């Protein structure tokens, strides 16, 4: 639970060896028919990041490269990206309030590589600043391809910011240069500032369930979900308010919004559970309440506040927006120069990732720069500087717009 | 980028 570094994975890397080189192993995960893998999601790690007076950051045995009495202080975290070029737009949803970024380049595909800056194309509005140059061809074709290919990849670094950390030519099946890669991600990647004593909040992302058949009714049960901190550090056992929570159906007033808070026990931390919520990673929040409400799949997209919080939540929405004048990065000369990105039509489905929550976007009135919308469910107020409008243009989603709360 | 010629000698002379 320390760093939310991102990664940009196109087709055919070999992904379990590189991610498990930087996350150790996979978590025990479950409850199939999950959510479609182009939606919002988060990563994790079963490792940590450290050193041993050593460029090498091994796995937690203390001798095997050599000694160095590892600092059992923190745990590394991560954000997932499977190895196909589809993984653009939900990652650019994730490329706003994460921590850093990996940058994946193969040599298996086209060597005048099309996809990487087709992938990395929000280096201005949101944050995209900490990367690495990472060659993934040591296997098939030797030093001629890599020889011209380092000139290829240094033909990327000029105004498109592709120079954050220089070339690492590897195949992660050998796990090579992970001493040098770990030295880069210790030293050459910093840790950005946070806030500590702020009142903590969370929007719920990835719910779970812990009452499989075969136990007693006297067990402690409740609602476990997933999340990651935007502010504060969340302790155990207080008035943890969720402000509308359930969709308040047939709500006739304003004070007919229900006061519902909870408590908390589990905050999963790979071996333990530090009861103050360690940010910079996936936090394993489990609520006290025993309903049909939260511990089902019913709850994704609600706030974590306290008694007497500030945001009042209704549907009155007006947004100021603009668009993108092509489909971002995609330009194929074999009959693909008309992937047209059309203006906001009335009553059209969208994806409005306000902050970091996927609710589908409905619209009601269209001007050239502002729009009055109404949304599919009651949705909290998070930020005005980004309202990440996405929209159907192909089989999966792509992001099209940037918004502003008015 | 000295890391690349470090690979070019040692890594490819010893490993893949």
């Amino acid at each position: 639970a320390t760093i939310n570094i991102g990664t940009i994975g196109h087709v055919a890397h070999g992904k379990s060896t590189v991610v498990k080189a930087i996350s150790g192993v996979h978590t025990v995960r479950f409850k199939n028919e999950l959510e479609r893998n182009i939606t919002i999601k988060l990563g994790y790690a079963n490792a940590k990041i450290y050193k041993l007076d050593d460029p090498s950051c091994p796995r937690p045995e203390c001798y095997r490269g050599t000694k160095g009495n590892f600092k059992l202080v923190r745990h590394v975290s991560f954000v997932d990206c499977p190895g196909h070029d589809i993984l653009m737009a939900t990652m650019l949803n994730g490329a706003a309030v994460m921590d850093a970024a990996l940058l994946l380049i193969a040599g298996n595909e086209s060597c005048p590589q099309p996809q990487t800056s087709e992938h990395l194309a929000a280096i201005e509005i949101m944050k995209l600043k900490h990367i690495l140059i990472l060659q993934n061809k040591i296997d098939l074709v030797k030093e001629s391809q890599a020889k011209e290919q380092y000139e290829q990849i240094l033909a990327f670094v000029q105004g498109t910011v592709a120079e954050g950390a220089p070339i690492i030519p590897i195949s992660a099946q050998l796990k090579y240069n992970i001493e040098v890669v770990c030295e880069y991600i210790v030293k050459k990647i910093p840790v950005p500032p946070r806030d500590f004593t702020s009142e903590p909040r969370l929007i719920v992302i990835r719910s779970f369930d812990v009452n499989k058949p075969g136990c007693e009714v006297d067990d402690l049960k409740g609602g476990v979900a997933g999340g990651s901190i935007l502010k504060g550090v969340l302790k155990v056992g207080q008035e943890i308010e969720v402000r509308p929570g359930i969709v308040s159906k047939d709500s006739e007033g304003k004070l007919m919004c229900k006061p519902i808070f909870s408590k908390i026990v589990s905050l999963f931390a790979e071996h333990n559970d530090l009861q103050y919520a360690a940010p910079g990673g996936l936090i394993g929040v489990g609520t006290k309440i025993d309903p049909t409400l939260c511990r089902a799949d019913r709850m994704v997209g609600q706030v974590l506040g306290a008694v007497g919080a500030l945001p009042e939540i209704f549907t009155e929405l007006e947004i100021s927006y603009f668009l993108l004048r092509r489909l971002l990065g995609v330009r194929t000369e074999g009959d693909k120069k008309a992937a047209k990105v059309q203006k906001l039509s009335k009553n059209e489905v969208l994806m409005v990732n306000i902050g970091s929550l996927s609710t589908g976007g409905r619209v009601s009135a269209v001007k050239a720069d502002l729009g009055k919308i109404v949304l599919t469910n009651p949705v909290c107020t998070e930020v005005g500087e980004k309202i990440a409008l996405s929209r159907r243009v192909e089989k999966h989603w792509r992001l099209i717009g940037w918004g502003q709360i008015r | 980028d000295y890391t690349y010629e470090e690979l070019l000698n040692r890594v490819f002379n010893i490993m893949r």
Binding site: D209, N211, G214, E216, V217, D218, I260, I289, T292, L293 | -
Partner: protein, 113 residues
């Protein structure tokens, strides 16, 4: 039930009949019934009442003897009733409707048959 069983004991008492025959064919008849529940509540009197929903599970575990609540139906569970007596039926009904009639209305929750 006639444990005064004397007066021509045939044998020691009933030998060939009581080795398996008296015991062997009791022929008890019973029909499975599965009276359900659906209680929940919401609020901070609902956090007290969701504590009280969990102790309602405890309460129909230990007080009036409904036996072996299992966890097979993940929204809401079952409580068992089998006739060896048949008079568990009116007791379970009286207590479940005492739950709906005094327990839930003091804590502002949702429940019916």
């Amino acid at each position: 039930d006639p444990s005064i069983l004397d007066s021509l004991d045939l044998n020691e008492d009933e030998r060939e009949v009581l080795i398996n025959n008296i015991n062997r064919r009791l022929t008890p008849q019973a029909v499975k019934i599965r009276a359900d529940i659906e209680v929940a509540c919401y609020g901070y009197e609902g956090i007290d009442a969701v504590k009280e929903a969990l102790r309602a599970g405890l309460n129909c575990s230990t007080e009036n003897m409904p036996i072996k609540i299992n966890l097979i139906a993940p929204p809401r569970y079952v409580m068992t009733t089998t006739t060896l007596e048949r008079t568990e039926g009116l007791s379970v009904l009286s207590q479940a409707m005492a739950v709906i009639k005094e327990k839930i209305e003091e804590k502002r929750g949702v429940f019916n048959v």
